[PDB]
Design a protein around this ligand. Structure first.
Ligand SMILES: CCCCCCCCCCCCCCCCCC(=O)OC[C@H](COP(=O)([O-])OCC(O)COP(=O)([O-])OC[C@@H](COC(=O)CCCCCCCCCCCCCCCCC)OC(=O)CCCCCCCCCCCCCCCCC)OC(=O)CCCCCCCCCCCCCCCCC
Ligand SMILES: CCCCCCCCCCCCCCCCCC(=O)OC[C@H](COP(=O)([O-])OCC[N+](C)(C)C)OC(=O)CCCCCCCCCCCCCCCCC
Ligand SMILES: CCCCCCCCCCCCCCCCCC(=O)OC[C@H](COP(=O)([O-])OCC[N+](C)(C)C)OC(=O)CCCCCCCCCCCCCCCCC
Ligand SMILES: CCCCCCCCCCCCCCCCCC(=O)OC[C@H](COP(=O)(O)OCCN)OC(=O)CCCCCCCCCCCCCCCCC
Ligand SMILES: CCCCCCCCCCCCCCCCCC(=O)OC[C@H](COP(=O)(O)OCCN)OC(=O)CCCCCCCCCCCCCCCCC
Ligand SMILES: CCCCCCCCCCCCCCCCCC(=O)OC[C@H](COP(=O)(O)OCCN)OC(=O)CCCCCCCCCCCCCCCCC
Ligand code: SF4
Ligand code: SF4
Ligand code: SF4
Lengths: 360, 115, 97, 55, 70, 156, 318, 176, 80
């Protein structure tokens, strides 16, 4: 059972996403990103939206930026509930799985109230978001966030002080910092190894430079420090959600260029320029200026990047998708040197892998 | 006699719950359902290859501590003797010899696993 | 003691469904025993109930009819049997029946 | 919320926290399902003057 | 709520109350309204076989007191 | 007659035993595995319907193809299906498992698992809600309830 | 009429297994904030009947590569040894009153490993062989303390007799003088029976199902009910060892109800430990029962040898 | 702006060493975990009794498709093909002609519900609110081609669910 | 020895408890006044038959009835 070589054969979920993106418009290419990291939907929406807005030389309104950050942190709670609970399921503690999926069910209800679909929203669009917040949604986000701290506390009561959990995570999957950078690890896979790096602090985007949060740093590069980093990222996500609920601005939710954002249906059905723009946006799409960009955000797995190449038309010429899980699953070969089959499962757990974005 | 009747009954309705499990349902056997299971794909080689034991010194030492509980077992009976200092001395000497064996296997890193 | 109050609440849920026979009816058809404010009934027999003391998800339910469009739905109840005017209220799309 | 005070006290003792202040089951305190009609504000370019697209 | 597990446990409790109680009754039926004679030791078996011999009906649980002697 | 009543009650017995003890196998593929996990979550709770995970295909009843079936895992899906005892059932979850889905015109997507396995219930959605997947499971139970195995056997 | 006594032993302890599946799923449900089975019967009371009928009408699936004689002979031996470890258990009077019933329990604990062992070997698959040798790696760890703990708890009894273990505890529970032996025995019975955190043979996330990954329904039911028969038997054995009740010789039903509710509390404790902990890596299992429980067990064995000599409390063998 | 998870050196006085040794020998945190599991045992579980109770939804919800009609009987689809031009799966197939009274209406309006990704671009691209994605989601089929809706099935879904779709659009349309 | 004792109680408390229980089990039966009563109770338990002796005439301590004043007595067992 001492593992000598791991060969992860992938491509079992390779569907050729980024060739299908080449033949559809930008708005038609947006719901592919919900289905890459299928526990981090609006984070991939936000990464593709920042890529297209970077190529379009436009920016969202302030309210749409704060909505993007609020639902990106709700998305971060979703992804780290998925990470921690499936990691404890794979080690054997199948109970906080069921404890935390009720909270994850309520955040899926937040998605259903804000966009209409529980998982794949197609909501964070290039130009801001699609539709404004319904009334009383922020009050229920507050009622959720006021009580989610005790849920993290009882998860941490079950697993953090537990000696069976420390026996499965502490000497397991140690990653040195230079081999973390030289393998292209990102996010918690760096931060468990003690590397001071986070893309919401170093390369700040929409209003993350206006919120206040702390970046949890590990010390030993193992599964236990990455576990504690994920739990503390849930804590600091609740912190950012409180700061976004308190500091939400009024205003619009799309960019007020109607050659990018679609006009409102109350003024599409009255104005002639707005009807022409509605027509030509939902049929042709907005022309993006030509050129390439690499837009990388801090998805809850790590650096999620879109290398987007536009050729002047209303369709992408090329859309390369950098996922964190691809380089992390490449590093699985080193991380499983000198462990066993009951530890390779925990290393697959501590590398939070979702194989849609690994496989495209 | 009653013990053999009980064992025969338990074996009988163990093998009566097997012959009503094979002969009752409807079978559709074909040469892919009876294949070996290796998580969707084919097994790379047979399972009759040498599956190497890393816990082998502990596996031998199980046989040398399993004799100890063939020696240490009449202690509920040996306490009923009329030579009690000698019985106590030999009893604690045997548990002490087991402990010295376990301590020697501790310090020579034998309870640790290979590789 | 509040344990005898729990037994009284059990007995009045037994007496609330129209006796022990109706209690067994709603038990074996619903796997659920609690009484509720009978909000409405459609043109088929679906009885729509409220209980705002229950938590958000148990607070609105339907006890389906036994005969809808010529099918014996006494045991074969279906989630799609709800007509669309009650499908807002049951799925909590509105506060108004 | 209908848990009797003996079970409520045993449950608070077993968890070690005060659980009724932070219940993970939702009740009357959450938003109404039927909301009043809104009035969404218009953007900065909803103007009738000094609003050329070229600028 | 939680007390719905209390029926099934009870049924399991019934299924654990049936065997032992039954053999208690069985040990009082085929042994004359008393406990089963425990012969852990061969002296106890010699007394039990002596009871089987002195009963006259080849059953150890048939007792003969002072009414048997003159 | 008498024997028609006997085989009718035996059909009702075995259809009850097979619809109220469906053991799905742990088989997800894509985003729909998240909503299948939410159909196992404490709100919807598959386990109250007799619906409990069994990890091996030998010890499972229904194969919920939940996600996108690519060309690389089509024989893995088929050998997993083949290594299920009979009666085995298939529930198709999501648009990619139904008919190719959002990746329909792809070079490496099996356009529906009905090309590979025989499919009983099609559950539509991208993803379908866990309430809709539980609806599909209850419709599978209704399909098992009206099976006529021993009635057809007594009439053949 | 003794055949009636054997049948009234072995049929209710199959129905106790059957309704233990319902108790297991509902207690595991409510401890996981969900519900258990409550749809099939009135609050789930008919779910085990459907789970039992379904497995004996599903296709049996003898594999190709299997050694079919051992493949069928292993669940037969599994269910046989599941049934025959109930016969010395005093309830307050056992079915078969043995002078050496404790060693009978220990020897049939040792022989029950060959069920899992020959089942994992005979079903010629790879996960089955991994689970079959993790059964060895678990058994050589628990058997090397299961004898000494059970030896030291009988040094206050006087013999290997299970019936005398009720007379022994007439004044005090035997968990009061030997609570380290009790809290170590309980973990050794966890590891004995492949219950979590010591699953490790039917390890659902390391392996697929481990030793019975090839056993389809019908032959699979006789490992499921064997495992649950072993946990009910083993909690009854732990109740007789450490939590023995009041025996009225004229009213055996008082003792029977008392140790019934105590053994139910211990089985609920098994299900409640299963619903709370992660699972060991099976070297950390072996570095537990050898490096933590065995030295302390030898120390407590020295203590419980020398202590009845110390206090003139040597128990009688009669 | 950053914090160190797991950088606490344990205290080395006899009090805390004895506390950690009693934690090792008497299993404090294991009883803590059992206490938290027992604390969830005595709670009201969150299991709604489906199919008698339904999970909460919003009027934005995206389920089964439906073609609406004006409040005159005339159907709203005027064959403009924005919904199939914006459709990211190309599930919509439209063919039209002028009908007998000269109106621009469709002859073929197909939505493949096994290609459809339920993202609601067709209801937000439709300039007359003709195609909408309604509130039904329990429309599972036993057969694959029953999820290949033509115009007649979409019009029947509209005439079936219009009494609910009109109220969802009435509650929602100010956000659009 | 004391700083090492706190160090090994901080590192391996199971081993300190093991050596402590083993050391008490070795030394403490040599420190008990009750250990004499252990062997006295063991040699005072009549498993076999107390085979009588032929009265040649000179045995004043060997009794003639089991209720005689002379002989081994077990009143120390009743009092303790
Ligand atoms: C173990 C011993 C019995 C414990 C009895 C019990 O659980 O009482 C619940 C009672 C209140 O429990 P709770 O968790 O606060 O739940 C409040 C109910 O939701 C509030 O009650 P409710 O509004 O849900 O009322 C409905 C409910 C009311 O509940 C009852 O009537 C419970 C009956 C249990 C017997 O009745 C039913 O659901 C019908 C009966 C279905 C369960 C039948 C169980 C049979 C078990 C034996 C076979 O528990 C106690 O008072 C503490 C335990 C008392 C132990 C006494 C010493 C032994
Ligand atoms: C301990 C718990 C379990 C207890 C035992 C199980 C309880 C239920 C016992 C009766 C179950 C019914 C018989 C077995 C199931 C047969 C299902 C089946 O496939 O039937 C079609 C089969 C075959 O019917 P067929 O001719 O249509 O075959 C179909 C297969 N092809 C088309 C490929 C040929 O029917 C039988 O084999 C008849 C079974 C006997 C009927 C019952 C007799 C009394 C049993 C008591
Ligand atoms: C039978 C009824 C129930 C009985 C009670 C048990 C109920 C509670 C069960 C809780 C769930 C447990 C699930 C399995 C957990 C498995 C992990 C585990 O706990 O491993 C064991 C753990 C292992 O600890 P560990 O895993 O930290 O190992 C440390 C290893 N190093 C240091 C190398 C890192 O603890 C033990 O081994 C303790 C064994 C029992 C100790 C008993 C001591 C008694 C007192 C002795 C004397 C002390 C004073 C000195 C002398 C004084 C004289 C005056
Ligand atoms: C000549 C005469 C004899 C002929 C041969 C027949 C022998 C007897 C066979 C068993 C009895 C036959 C009837 C079986 C059930 C038929 C009725 C039925 O299916 O009713 C439906 C109803 C459940 O409805 P459902 O749709 O599940 O409810 C949804 C919740 N709203 O169902 C219910 O509410 C209850 C269903 C009960 C099912 C039967 C009870 C379990 C089986 C017990 C006997 C067999 C097993 C014995 C022990 C074996 C070892 C464990
Ligand atoms: C040591 C103790 C061991 C105990 C083991 C058993 C524990 C649980 C006991 C049962 C608990 C109650 C179960 C009730 C199930 C539902 C019964 C029912 O109503 O079934 C309805 C079904 C269909 O009826 P139908 O007429 O079609 O209805 C249409 C109406 N318009 O009709 C049918 O399905 C037909 C009738 C079937 C009735 C089956 C009832 C359960 C039988 C279980 C077997 C054990 C019996 C007792 C054994 C111990 C005592 C001797
Ligand atoms: C007098 C009666 C008979 C005594 C002898 C018999 C005891 C029977 C009980 C069972 C013992 C079996 C196992 C013994 C192994 C001892 C050796 C050992 O483990 O040394 C290593 C250990 C440090 O562990 P480490 O190096 O980390 O191990 C690798 C894994 N981590 O190093 C240590 O932990 C230090 C070990 C030596 C010092 C122990 C001091 C304990 C003192 C307690 C009070 C005095 C008790 C009287 C006994 C004398 C103790 C010196
Ligand atoms: S049908 Fe769609 S949402 Fe569902 S798993 Fe497939 S890609 Fe993901
Ligand atoms: S919801 Fe999306 S995929 Fe479905 S028909 Fe409308 S635009 Fe096409
Ligand atoms: S449904 Fe709407 S968008 Fe589509 S062709 Fe008809 S009118 Fe145009």
């Amino acid at each position: 059972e001492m593992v000598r070589k791991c060969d992860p054969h992938i491509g079992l979920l390779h569907r050729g996403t980024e060739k299908l993106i080449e033949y559809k418009t930008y708005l038609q290419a947006l719901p592919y990103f919900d289905r890459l990291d299928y526990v981090s939907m609006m984070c991939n929406e936000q990464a593709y939206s920042l890529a297209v807005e970077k190529l379009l030389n436009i920016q969202p309104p302030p309210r749409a930026q704060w909505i993007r950050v609020l639902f990106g942190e709700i998305t971060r709670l979703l992804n780290h509930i998925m990470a921690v609970t499936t990691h404890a399921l794979d080690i054997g503690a199948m109970t906080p799985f069921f404890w935390m999926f009720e909270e994850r069910e309520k955040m899926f209800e937040f998605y259903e109230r804000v966009s209409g679909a529980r998982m794949h929203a197609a909501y964070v669009r290039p130009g801001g978001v699609h539709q404004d917040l319904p009334l009383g949604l922020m009050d229920d986000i507050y009622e959720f966030s006021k009580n989610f701290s005790l849920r993290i506390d009882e998860l941490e009561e079950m697993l953090t002080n537990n000696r069976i959990w420390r026996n499965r995570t502490v000497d397991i999957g140690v990653v040195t910092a230079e081999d973390a950078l030289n393998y292209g690890f990102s996010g918690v896979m760096l931060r468990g190894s003690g590397i001071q790096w986070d893309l919401r602090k170093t390369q700040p985007y929409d209003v993350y430079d206006q919120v206040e949060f702390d970046v949890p740093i590990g010390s030993r590069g193992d599964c236990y420090d990455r576990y504690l980093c994920r739990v503390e990222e849930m804590r600091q996500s609740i912190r950012i959600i409180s700061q976004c609920l308190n500091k939400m601005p009024p205003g619009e939710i799309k960019v007020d260029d109607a050659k990018v954002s679609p006009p409102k249906r109350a003024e599409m059905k009255t104005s002639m320029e707005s009807l022409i723009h509605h027509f030509k946006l939902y049929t042709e799409g907005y022309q993006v200026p030509p050129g390439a960009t690499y837009t990388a955000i801090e998805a809850p797995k790590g650096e999620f990047g879109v290398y987007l190449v536009s050729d002047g038309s209303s369709r992408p010429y090329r859309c390369k998708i950098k996922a964190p899980g691809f380089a992390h699953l490449a590093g699985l070969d080193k991380m499983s040197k000198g462990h066993m089959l009951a530890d390779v499962v925990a290393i697959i757990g501590t590398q939070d892998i979702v194989f849609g974005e690994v496989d495209r | 006699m009653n013990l053999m009747i009980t064992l025969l009954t338990n074996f009988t309705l163990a093998t009566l719950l097997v012959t009503i499990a094979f002969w009752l349902p409807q079978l559709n056997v074909y040469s892919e359902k009876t294949s070996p299971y290796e998580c969707g794909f084919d097994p790379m080689g047979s399972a009759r290859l040498p599956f190497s034991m890393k816990f082998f010194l502990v596996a031998i030492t199980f046989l040398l501590f399993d004799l100890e509980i063939a020696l240490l077992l009449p202690l509920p009976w040996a306490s009923q003797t009329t030579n009690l200092n000698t019985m106590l001395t030999m009893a604690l000497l045997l548990i002490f010899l087991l402990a010295v064996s376990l301590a020697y296997e501790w310090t020579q890193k034998g309870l640790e696993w290979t590789e | 003691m509040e344990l005898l109050q729990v037994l009284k609440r059990g007995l009045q849920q037994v007496s609330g469904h129209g006796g022990l026979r109706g209690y067994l009816r709603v038990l074996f058809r619903a796997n659920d025993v609690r009484v509720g404010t009978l909000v409405g009934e459609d043109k088929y027999g679906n009885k729509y109930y409220e209980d705002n003391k229950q938590f958000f998800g148990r607070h609105r339910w339907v006890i389906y009819t036994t005969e809808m469009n010529g099918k014996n739905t006494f045991w074969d109840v279906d989630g799609s049997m709800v007509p669309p005017e009650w499908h807002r209220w049951l799925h909590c799309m509105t506060d108004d029946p | 919320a209908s848990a009797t005070r003996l079970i409520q006290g045993l449950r608070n003792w077993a968890s070690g926290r005060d659980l009724q202040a932070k219940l993970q089951l939702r009740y009357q305190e959450i938003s109404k399902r039927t909301q009043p009609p809104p009035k969404l504000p218009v953007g900065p370019s909803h103007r009738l003057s000094n609003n050329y697209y070229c600028a | 709520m939680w007390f719905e597990v209390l029926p099934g446990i009870a049924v399991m409790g019934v299924c654990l109350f049936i065997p032992g109680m039954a053999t208690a009754r069985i040990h009082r039926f085929s042994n004359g309204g008393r406990e089963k004679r425990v012969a852990h030791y061969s002296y106890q078996w010699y007394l039990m076989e002596r009871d089987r011999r002195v009963s006259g009906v080849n059953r150890y649980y048939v007792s003969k007191g002072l009414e048997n002697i003159d | 007659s008498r024997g028609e009543y006997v085989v009718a009650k035996l059909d009702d017995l075995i259809n009850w035993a097979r619809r109220s003890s469906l053991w799905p196998m742990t088989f997800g593929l894509a985003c729909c595995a998240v909503e299948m996990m939410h159909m196992a979550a404490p709100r919807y709770d598959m386990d109250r319907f007799g619906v409990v995970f069994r990890a091996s295909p030998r010890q499972s009843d229904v194969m919920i193809v939940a996600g996108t079936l690519t060309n690389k895992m089509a024989p893995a899906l088929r050998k997993v299906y083949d290594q299920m005892p009979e009666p085995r059932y298939v529930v198709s979850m999501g648009s990619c498992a139904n008919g190719g889905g959002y990746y329909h015109y792809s070079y490496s997507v099996v356009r529906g698992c009905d090309r590979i396995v025989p499919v009983d219930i099609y559950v539509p959605g991208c993803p379908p809600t866990a309430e809709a997947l539980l609806y599909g499971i209850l419709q599978l139970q209704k399909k098992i309830k009206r099976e006529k195995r021993l009635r057809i056997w007594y009439r053949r | 009429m003794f055949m009636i006594n054997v049948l009234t032993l072995i049929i209710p302890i199959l129905l106790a297994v059957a309704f233990l599946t319902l108790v297991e799923r509902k207690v595991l449900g409510y401890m996981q904030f969900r519900k258990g089975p409550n749809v099939v019967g009135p609050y789930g009371l008919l779910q085990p009947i459907a789970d039992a009928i379904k497995l004996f009408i599903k296709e049996p699936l003898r594999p190709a590569t299997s050694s079919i004689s051992m493949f069928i002979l292993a669940p037969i031996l599994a269910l046989t040894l599941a049934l025959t470890m109930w016969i010395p258990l005093p309830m307050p009077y056992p079915l078969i009153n043995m002078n050496l019933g404790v060693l009978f329990m220990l020897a049939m604990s040792s022989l029950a490993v060959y069920s899992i062992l020959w089942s994992g070997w005979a079903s010629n698959s790879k996960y089955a062989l991994i689970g079959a040798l993790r059964a060895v790696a678990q058994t050589i760890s628990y058997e090397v303390t299961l004898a000494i703990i059970l030896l030291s708890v009988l040094l206050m009894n006087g013999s290997f007799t299970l019936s005398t273990l009720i007379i022994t505890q007439e004044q005090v529970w035997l968990i009061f003088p030997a609570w380290p032996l009790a809290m170590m025995w309980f973990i050794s019975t966890l590891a004995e029976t492949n219950r979590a955190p010591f699953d490790l043979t039917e390890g659902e996330s390391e392996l697929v199902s481990g030793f019975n990954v090839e056993y389809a329904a019908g032959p699979f039911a006789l490992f499921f009910m064997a495992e649950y028969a072993n946990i009910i038997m083993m909690n009854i054995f732990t109740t007789t060892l450490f939590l023995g009740a009041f025996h009225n010789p004229y009213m055996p039903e008082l003792y029977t109800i008392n140790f019934t509710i105590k053994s139910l509390l211990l089985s609920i404790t098994f299900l409640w430990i299963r619903a709370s902990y992660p699972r060991f890596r099976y070297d950390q299992l072996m570095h537990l029962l050898w490096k933590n429980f065995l030295p302390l067990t030898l120390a407590l064995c020295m203590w419980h040898v020398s202590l009845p000599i110390l206090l003139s409390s040597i128990p009688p063998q009669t | 702006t950053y914090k160190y998870v797991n950088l606490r050196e344990p205290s080395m006085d006899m009090k805390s060493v004895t506390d950690r040794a009693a934690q090792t020998l008497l299993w404090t945190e294991l009883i803590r975990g059992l206490g938290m599991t027992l604390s969830y045992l005595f709670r009201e579980p969150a299991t709604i009794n489906y199919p008698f109770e339904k999970g909460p939804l919003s009027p934005r919800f995206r389920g089964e498709h439906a073609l609406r009609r004006y409040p005159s009987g005339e159907e709203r689809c005027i064959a403009c093909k924005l919904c199939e031009a914006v459709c990211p799966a190309q599930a919509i197939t439209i063919e039209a002609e002028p009908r007998a009274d000269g109106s621009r209406r469709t002859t073929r309006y197909d939505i493949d519900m096994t290609k459809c990704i339920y993202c609601g671009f067709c209801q937000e691209a439709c300039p007359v609110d003709a195609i909408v994605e309604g509130p039904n989601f329990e429309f599972s089929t036993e057969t694959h081609e029953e999820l290949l809706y033509n115009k007649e099935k979409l019009l029947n879904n509209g005439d079936k669910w219009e009494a609910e779709i009109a109220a969802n659009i009435q509650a929602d349309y100010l956000y659009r | 020895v004391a700083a090492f004792l706190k160090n090994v109680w901080a590192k391996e408390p199971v081993l300190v408890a093991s050596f402590a229980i083993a050391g008490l089990a070795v030394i403490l039966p040599t420190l008990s006044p009750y250990t004499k009563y252990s062997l006295m109770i063991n040699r005072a338990t009549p498993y076999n038959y107390p085979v009588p002796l032929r009265d040649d005439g000179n045995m004043p301590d060997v009794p003639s009835h089991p209720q005689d004043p002379q002989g081994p007595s077990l009143e120390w067992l009743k009092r303790l």
